[PDB]
């Protein structure tokens, strides 16, 4: 009789609310540097090649993309809350972009 009682798992939302507080308190970059840099180079390749990208330009692009995505997710959370849901769906993303004017 040497068995061990298990601590079970957390409820859905508890670790979510914890990590919400943790990411809203801290300020580090959430997108990995090298895959984002490769993605930026892939997008820039389509117009004209042999285009070198300074580290500061890549960092500015990353900061702008993170700010845009955070604002869009705040608006999409407001959309989901308005529809009596707690889970965001792509339809809220499309509606937020529509009302913001980014999507025609």
């Amino acid at each position: 009789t040497g068995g061990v009682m298990k601590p079970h798992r957390y409820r859905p939302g508890t670790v979510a609310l914890r990590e919400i507080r943790r990411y809203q308190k801290s300020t580090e970059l959430l997108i990995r540097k090298l895959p984002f840099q490769r993605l930026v180079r892939e997008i820039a390749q389509d117009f004209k090649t042999d285009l070198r990208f300074q580290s500061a330009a890549i960092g500015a692009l990353q900061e702008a993309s993170e700010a845009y995505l955070v604002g869009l997710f705040e608006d999409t959370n407001l959309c989901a809350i308005h529809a009596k849901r707690v889970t965001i769906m792509p339809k809220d993303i499309q509606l937020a972009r529509r009302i913001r004017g980014e999507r025609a």
């Binding site: 809203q24 300020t27 809350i81």
Partner: protein
């Protein structure tokens, strides 16, 4: 002034972009003036919705 005060509540002697973002976004008229600007390494103000919380 507002950034130094916000740093003072954080028990810090170093002004960082986080304190600047806190000072700008927590003041109504400053938020109105600097509406369409993103502060690099500023982060986001802690905001959790009321009905988002469990009961």
């Amino acid at each position: 002034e507002l950034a130094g005060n916000a740093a003072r509540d954080n028990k810090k002697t170093r002004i960082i972009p986080r304190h600047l973002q806190l000072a700008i976004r927590n003041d109504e008229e400053l938020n109105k003036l600097l509406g369409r600007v993103t502060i690099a390494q500023g982060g986001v103000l802690p905001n959790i919705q009321a009905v988002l919380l469990p009961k």
